[PDB]
Structure 1
């Protein structure tokens, strides 16, 4: 599909209008995921430039979308200061305005959510390289390519969109993207992948090793159960003409003794690996990946750990907040796994 990547390059006025609105939010509210801001977020998002809202709406209803990319948001590199050395330190005063702007864009597509078991239950999260995590399977890696995945593939409450706001990317490190062409894998493999014949485990970002030590053990019970005793699930669902994709290259296995399944997965892993194409998010670029249609990852790179490294703000978006109420503390709470 020629519009699988939908791009909007902001005019100077559109960039300035979006920055003014984000700065007005930072003037009013404490955190870019403060409860009062999130209650207000859908309507405040309506104040984004009309031409931009029109293109975001076209992307939202495009069921073959890979990513919407909004290029050319204002990012003041000097005002922003150094790239923090850990996501725990990345809730900086100077970066608030970019968290608010990410939530405003995201709220055109759905409702923002976070995870009790990821980055201490923050809704606005950070992607930056961490010294000692170079060879990890988590988004703070650098030397080892981030393996392609559906975000939170293990969960029925996985996002419909993953939002990425690039604050800085001096070495032009690519985000990787791939969809599935059913015609190129075969009706045979599609049929197998549509069967509940696979195990998808929570990735390592959901482990207590990637959260603050004080975070409640109760939050992690469900994750540990999903690692030990994964449910039998499909990789494909929906219409045969526009099927949804759910798979993590490093956390997905066929159910024991299902050689057909093991072979379908093997064939899917080889097909997605080669199809993987590059999208570079420069400073001020906001992307929304359709997590129903594509797997994504990140090319290997050398981090400098000198305060100049690549830094994204990130958010999960659901089309339907109500559906996850069983996993949320209360109606307005956005943190999946607090119930």
Structure 2
């Protein structure tokens, strides 16, 4: 299991519910005002909660993730949308609770090329099966990855709030610290070498869309940073080793992930913060019904520094333009 857990008491959950009334702007149509109101209102959250979130945000020895339990109950939840294009989560009370927690940690951001720049994306099963694929997506394991491995503007954190869970849908987490503990000195040194080229994810592609950084990037290393607190960039579908040993080292990371990954089945009222520099994530197979009661998460992204993406956004805008990813 996860172990890095923050459990809100009923009094803390009640304070959070009250503080959410200070966030009144439309999350989709006035994203910057919505996020700025959440950042200001987050000062009213219980100090014990704020302390834990700031410690996690600092990063040093943070475990790669933070699971938050005991959020106020999801009460009049609409049916789970059958597609992930509606942005239903963005108008629920859970999205306000998620914004308050997010804005303690850092600045919320969105990407034009990822779910049409929605402040909160609906993470719901897709019935879609493209040419290469032999299954709709939930029918296969979502492989270990860091979010936007190809992009220097990738989020620092991935935020997932659970509206409806599925008991067979396990979220898998595996930290860069867990990886390094299983490797030899030589494997660690090689993972720190720029031996992997990156490719823009197919979902980021569009007619007439050109990326300033091109379609193929790198070579880049898989590991970087401090020896005792390494950062990881990984994605087997979008990363190709420049040589046979670099390709074999990707397999070594995958085997270590299967051996050491921790799992958690997200349930209503829970929120998971993933440190996108310190951990990789994945998801098991599950069997959605597309009946209105399927697994439904609200996903959002966090960056420590909004100035790093200013060149890619408009003034008082929260959306990174596609060509800059």
| TM-score, normalised via structure 1 length | 0.85
- Indicate which of 71, 74, 92 corresponds to 2:72: 74
CA separation in 2, counterparts of 1:308 and 1:135?
Answer: 28
Gap change, CA 1:309 and 1:267, over 3 Å in 2? same
| Aligned equivalents of 2:259, 2:237: Cα separation in 1 | 16
Q: Which residue of 2 aligns with 1:244?
A: 231
Runs of 4+ in 1 over 6 A off after TM superposition: 134-137
Give 1:13's aligned residue.
Answer: 11
The alignment partner of 2:217 has SS state of coil
Of residues 122, 129, 132, the one that matches 2:118 is 122
- 8 Å contact 1:165–1:314 — kept in the other structure? yes
Cα distance between partner residues in 1 of 2:268 and 2:213: 37
CA–CA distance in structure 1, aligned partners of residues 84 and 188 of structure 2 = 39
Q: What secondary structure, in the 3-state scheme, does the structure 2 residue paired with 1:270 have?
A: helix
Q: 1:134 Cα shift?
A: 9.9
Q: Is the 8 A contact 1:128 1:311 kept in 2?
A: yes
Kindly report which structure 2 residues correspond to 1:55-204, keeping only aligned pairs within 5 A, or say none. 55-64=52-61, 65-77=63-75, 79-91=76-88, 95-133=91-129, 141-171=137-167, 173-180=169-176, 181-204=179-202
- Mapped to 1, the partners of 2:172 and 2:16 lie a distance apart of 27
Give CA-to-partner distance per residue, 1:74-96, whole Å, 9 cap, x none.
Answer: 2334x112111112123368x43
Pair 141,23 (structure 1): closer, same or farther in 2 beyond 3 Å = farther
Q: 1:333 aligns with which of 293, 297, 317?
A: 317
Q: How much does 1:285 deviate?
A: 0.4
Are 2:237 and 1:253 equivalent residues in the alignment?
Answer: no
Structure 2: runs of 5 or more not aligned: none
Counting only pairs closer than 5 Å after superposition, residues 250-329 of structure 1 correspond to structure 2 as 250-255=237-242, 258-329=243-314
Cα distance in structure 2, aligned partners of 1:328 and 1:150? 23
- TM-score when scaled to structure 2? 0.89
Matched residue, 1:212: none
